[PDB]
Amino acid sequence: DVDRIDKLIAHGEAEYNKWRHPDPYIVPWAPGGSKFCRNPTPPAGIEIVYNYGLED
Amino acid sequence: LEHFCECYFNLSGLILCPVLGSIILLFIPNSRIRLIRLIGLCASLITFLYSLVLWIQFDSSTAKFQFVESLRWLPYENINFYLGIDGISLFFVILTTFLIPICILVGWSGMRSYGKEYIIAFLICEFLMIAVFCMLDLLLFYVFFESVLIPMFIIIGVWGSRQRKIKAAYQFFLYTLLGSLFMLLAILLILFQTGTTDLQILLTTEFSERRQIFLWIAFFASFAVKVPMVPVHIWLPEAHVEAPTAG
């Protein structure tokens, strides 16, 4: 029954959301990990201008 | 009573320096950018050095106004005016003279499009501001402060970045003018009692409690718009943001 599936899903999702571990494990370089965004590779497309602000 | 000071370095020359710079620049062709820039920068630097010398000859034991010198207004000599500094105003003069050359240096790269009008405005601001810091009279304080509004108005409106500079300059001029007019009312109130507006004299005249309260409220209204104090502080954000960097 397709409408039973929707209610079984919705009941299930709220169950996971209620008894979810309050401090889940995350791989260090994954988002939210302890190594995330640490010494990341510089983005490409960056230009450094020399001789700016000359009087002439 | 002529009060001319014996010191070689006095307030008059420090006042004249940026005036001379401005008068020299009005006649130099805008085609001569290198000369205009160097004249303005050198004049401001000489003024800063003069202010440092004024610091050197300062007496830190006296409570009497130092380097006091007088300037006559009428041959009747009824209204005579004085210039002098003390421990309270000396450092503000030195700060003014230090900040003006910085302002000339900030717009060094864009001085091709600014012109003599930019350097002249800042030099006139410097001269008026030093004058304001050096006055021993309520009336001249009012004139020279009220005069600083014109070059600041020009500086905000012409070299500001966006079209919000219109509203910003309007609010600046109008708020400051209201405050200055209130000060003027207080200066005339004092004059009616004393017959003079000389600081050294009014420091020795007793004011009644009721008149002290009323004169304080008129002086308050003027100074509190410039502090700024709540709720007359709202002109400052638009004015300070919309102005050019040196402004």
- CA–CA distance, B63 with B84 (Å, rounded to integer): 12
Q: Give the H/E segment covering residue B69.
A: strand B66-72
Residue B120's contacts (CB-CB under 8 Å, 6 or more residues apart) are B22, B25, B26
> Which chain B residues are Cβ-neighbours of A55 within 8 angstroms?
37, 108-109, 111
Q: Give the H/E segment covering residue B67.
A: strand B66-72
Q: What are phi and psi of B89, to 5 degrees?
A: -105, -15
Q: Locate the chain B residue with the closest alpha carbon to A52.
A: B109
> Which chain A residues are Cβ-neighbours of B109 within 8 angstroms?
53-55
Which amino acid type is present at position A17? N
- Supply the Cα-derived Rg of chain A in whole angstroms: 25
| CA-to-CA dists, residue B221 to B135, B142, B144, B174, B229, angstroms | 20, 14, 18, 14, 10
Q: Give the H/E segment covering residue B76.
A: none
Structure tokens at B22: 């401005």
Give the technique used to solve this structure. cryo-EM
Reported resolution in A?
Answer: 2.7
For A54, the closest of B37, B109, B111 (CB atoms) is: B109
The whole-angstrom distance between B81's CA and the closest CA on chain A is: 44
> Which chain B residues are Cβ-neighbours of A49 within 8 angstroms?
none
Strands (E), chain A: none
Query: Which residues does B contribute to its contact with A (CB < 8 Å)?
Result: 37, 108-109, 111
Q: Are B143 and B71 in contact (CB under 8 A)?
A: no
- CA–CA distance, B131 with B123 (Å, rounded to integer): 12
Indicate yes or no: CB of B108 within 8 angstroms of CB of A54.
Answer: no
Secondary structure class of B66 (helix, strand, coil) = strand
Structure tokens at B127: 């001269």
A26-44 burial string, b = 16+ CB within 10 Å, else e? eeeeeeeeeeeeeeeeeee
Interface contact A45, partner B, CB < 8 A:
no
- Supply the Cα-derived Rg of chain B in whole angstroms: 19
- β-pairing, B80-85 with B66-72? antiparallel
Q: Exposed/middle/buried for B189, CB within 10 Å: 0-12, 13-18, 19+?
A: middle
Secondary structure class of B168 (helix, strand, coil) = helix
Strand partners, B70: B82
The whole-angstrom distance between A56's CA and the closest CA on chain B is: 7
The whole-angstrom distance between A47's CA and the closest CA on chain B is: 22
Secondary structure class of B82 (helix, strand, coil) = strand
